[PDB]
Amino acid sequence: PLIVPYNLPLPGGVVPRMLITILGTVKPNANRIALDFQRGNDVAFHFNPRFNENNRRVIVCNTKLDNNWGREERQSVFPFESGKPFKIQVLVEPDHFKVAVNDAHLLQYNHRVKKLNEISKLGISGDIDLTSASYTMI
Ligand SMILES: Cc1ccc(S[C@@H]2O[C@H](CO)[C@H](O)[C@H](n3cc(-c4cc(F)c(F)c(F)c4)nn3)[C@H]2O)cc1
Ligand SMILES: [Cl-]
């Protein structure tokens, strides 16, 4: 089991055709998960499943620039389930991050941070047992 929060370096940042795979199991009674693709202190892409926001389950995505969150993008399709194993795949494409969970397309997030080769860390946080985090080129 990897330690959470986990820091996965992305050497030289990200690039289209780069596929990031995260495997884990959601804890019983989970409240939150977060993936943070960071450019230094900025968060280029925050992917944040919330298991209980006003008694609804929602995915919140955003960007943090100069310590300020921007406009959220919200996805009510919610593929996670407390207690169950999951796979998150984040495929970097030219205009967006494309996210699939358990081999089903979930959402795309347009690139707000444009210096892809500076987005050189992925943080993984929240209410999971983390099994593996890796990347490959497809
Ligand atoms: C003006 C204003 C006021 C409130 C807000 S709320 C805010 O909303 C953001 C998206 O817009 C992020 O989700 C933020 N956030 C979540 C997490 C986090 C950290 C963890 F360790 C986790 F394990 C985890 F799953 C999640 N860290 N930071 C959240 O605080 C926004 C603007
Ligand atoms: Cl949260």
UniProtKB/Swiss-Prot annotation:
Domain Galectin span(s) in chain numbering: 6-136
Q: What's the superkingdom here?
A: Eukaryota
For this UniProt record, give its keywords in alphabetical order, as a comma-separated list. Acetylation, Cytoplasm, Differentiation, Disulfide bond, IgE-binding protein, Immunity, Innate immunity, Lectin, mRNA processing, mRNA splicing, Nucleus, Phosphoprotein, Repeat, Secreted, Spliceosome
Phosphoserine found at: 76
> Among the entry's GO cellular component annotations, what is one?
nucleoplasm
Q: Where in the cell is it found?
A: Cytoplasm; Nucleus; Secreted
- Asked if the keyword Cytoplasm belongs to this entry, the reply reads yes
Q: Where is this motif: Nuclear export signal?
A: 114-129
**Which sites bind a beta-D-galactoside?**
69-75
Name the Gene Ontology molecular function terms of this record. Answer: carbohydrate binding; chemoattractant activity; disaccharide binding; IgE binding; laminin binding; molecular condensate scaffold activity; protein phosphatase binding; protein phosphatase inhibitor activity
Q: Which GO terms describe its biological process?
A: eosinophil chemotaxis; epithelial cell differentiation; innate immune response; macrophage chemotaxis; monocyte chemotaxis; mononuclear cell migration; mRNA processing; negative regulation of endocytosis
* Known tissue expression: A major expression is found in the colonic epithelium. It is also abundant in the activated macrophages. Expressed in fetal membranes.
State how it assembles.
Probably forms homo- or heterodimers. Interacts with DMBT1. Interacts with CD6 and ALCAM. Forms a complex with the ITGA3, ITGB1 and CSPG4. Interacts with LGALS3BP, LYPD3, ZFTRAF1 and UACA. Interacts with TRIM16; this interaction mediates autophagy of damage endomembranes. Interacts with cargo receptor TMED10; the interaction mediates the translocation from the cytoplasm into the ERGIC (endoplasmic reticulum-Golgi intermediate compartment) and thereby secretion.
What exactly does this protein do?
A: Galactose-specific lectin which binds IgE. May mediate with the alpha-3, beta-1 integrin the stimulation by CSPG4 of endothelial cells migration. Together with DMBT1, required for terminal differentiation of columnar epithelial cells during early embryogenesis. In the nucleus: acts as a pre-mRNA splicing factor. Involved in acute inflammatory responses including neutrophil activation and adhesion, chemoattraction of monocytes macrophages, opsonization of apoptotic neutrophils, and activation of mast cells.
Protein name as catalogued: Galectin-3
UniProt gene name: LGALS3
Region of the whole protein represented:
113 to 250 of 250
